[PDB]
Amino acid sequence: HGMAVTKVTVDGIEFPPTITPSKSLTLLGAGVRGIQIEGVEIKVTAIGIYAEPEVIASHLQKWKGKSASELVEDDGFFKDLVQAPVEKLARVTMLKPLTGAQYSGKVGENTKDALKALGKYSEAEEEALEEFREFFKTKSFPPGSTIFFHLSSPSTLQISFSTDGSLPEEAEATIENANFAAALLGTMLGKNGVSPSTKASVAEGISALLMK
Ligand SMILES: [Cl-]
Ligand SMILES: [Cl-]
């Protein structure tokens, strides 16, 4: 379409290249998260990572001139991405049906595991995890349903969702703990083995952005 950007498809799920919830965020990358059941791995969600493009580029200048392949193997790169003081959005679409307990059980344990490794799992983060699971407890997510994790600032995680990929008008639940938010976004980026495919895709998008 010339210089216009169009939808990006991940495993049948269409991701818009930008999302404006009041400024516009660009798709940095998108991949899938699998889960293991007994000896079997299955793909359960598609994850798209969005951020303000000029702003995030200006915070990652030190990474300029590195290819996606190089960036993928610098864990310090993804850490800088998480901690950059920029608005971010993780958009999560179900590939398979999940109850809210099934969804938040594993994502919550990924987040807890990340915090513990950092020495940042204290009473505050434990309460944030409890609030997180509380929110998801009675929800259900058929294929195509979408969860939006919006970090308006690094301090707060706004959660909302829709039965299709459409944008909600407002947050449904908000978790006000910076460490928990960061670690959850970290798992959405795919850090610590959660999603190598999302990590690789975000490294490609950012490598492209830094070159622009
Ligand atoms: Cl599968
Ligand atoms: Cl997910």
Residue 198 to residue 80: CA distance in whole angstroms: 16
CATH number of 55-83+189-212: 1.10.890.20, 3.60.9.10, 1.20.120.330, 1.10.3720.10?
1.10.890.20
Residue 168 to residue 116: CA distance in whole angstroms: 32
Residue 199 to residue 193: CA distance in whole angstroms: 9
Ligand nearest to the CA of 95: 1
Ligand nearest to the CA of 46: 2
**25 C-alpha to center of ligand 1: Å?**
29
Contacts of 110 (CB under 8 A, 6+ apart): 187, 192, 194
Contacts of 75 (CB under 8 A, 6+ apart): 191
Domain at 1-54+84-188: CATH code? 3.50.70.10
Ligand nearest to the CA of 110: 2
**33 C-alpha to center of ligand 1: Å?**
10
Ligand nearest to the CA of 92: 2
Residue 199 to residue 78: CA distance in whole angstroms: 8
**107 C-alpha to center of ligand 2: Å?**
7
Domain-wise residue ranges, the chain: 1-54+84-188, 55-83+189-212
**98 C-alpha to center of ligand 2: Å?**
11
Elucidation technique: X-ray
**11 C-alpha to center of ligand 1: Å?**
10
**96 C-alpha to center of ligand 1: Å?**
8
Ligand nearest to the CA of 32: 2
Cα-Cα-Cα-Cα dihedral sign, residues 13, 16, 19, 25: positive
